[PDB]
Amino acid sequence: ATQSPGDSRRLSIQRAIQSLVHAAQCRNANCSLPSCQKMKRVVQHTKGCKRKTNGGCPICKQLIALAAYHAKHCQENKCPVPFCLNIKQKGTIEGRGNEFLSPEVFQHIWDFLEQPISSVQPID
Template sequence: MMVLYHLHNPTAPAFVTTCNVCHLDIETGQGWRCEVCPDYDVCNSCYQKDGGIDHPHKLTNHPSMAERDAQNKEARQLRVLQLRKMLDLLVHASQCRSAHCQYPNCRKVKGLFRHGIQCKTRASGGCVLCKKMWYLLQLHARACKESECHVPRCRDLKEHLRRLQQQSDSRRRAAVMEMMRQSCRGCC
């Protein structure tokens, strides 16, 4: 019966945590947990009474599943926003001809381009700056829809991605055809 309950209520806690001070059940997201001791939990009311003084280690607030999901969603949205800004900067820097550009970090990206041209180690040799540059260029190429893009290596990378997609499609088609051949042999 409990299995059915948890299948229909996936966010409900599977285990109830008990306060080590008052021994009452702690509602999800309403407790404090020791970072060192396993299974040492304190409810909010006991924590507010003594502030965790009776325990030698630091106690941290134990957020609910919904709070954690919200934090993860915010972090993901922030990362997407940062990547968009970085890709916009990449496009700007590839077209900018000003030596004293006011666009934030334009000179840094131009320096990254210059480094990529002059570097002897390269990304395959383990150069961190080259790896960053190639990562940005590949992200841009995947999202770019312009046929006459001015970002360095964009057309080459798009062509490479197109070939990889064709190879993947060919392998998938061949696998499907092979499965169909094998299933036809079994029915004859």
């Protein structure tokens, strides 16, 4: 067509989700992963994101895309991702939430996770 659907986006997204999902459910002494320990820092961002009540930070605003992308395939009793857990309890539209897209900035979050040299200074 003029534009193709986001099917291959899965190969790009699932790579970022392997770390996110695992780190969300990483609450155990037996849990020992490399990417996990790094991901924990990103989890602290939403943990203290008071800005959500004012709008939301770039990380938070961006992560929602992935929460919903995982929710179509994560439909369980106690979903690992804390954001998708809310999607399940609100799965009443099954359209608006699911249908989400973000620009190349989506990749920038995973870059600073390892190289904190930007402070994601929000702008207009």
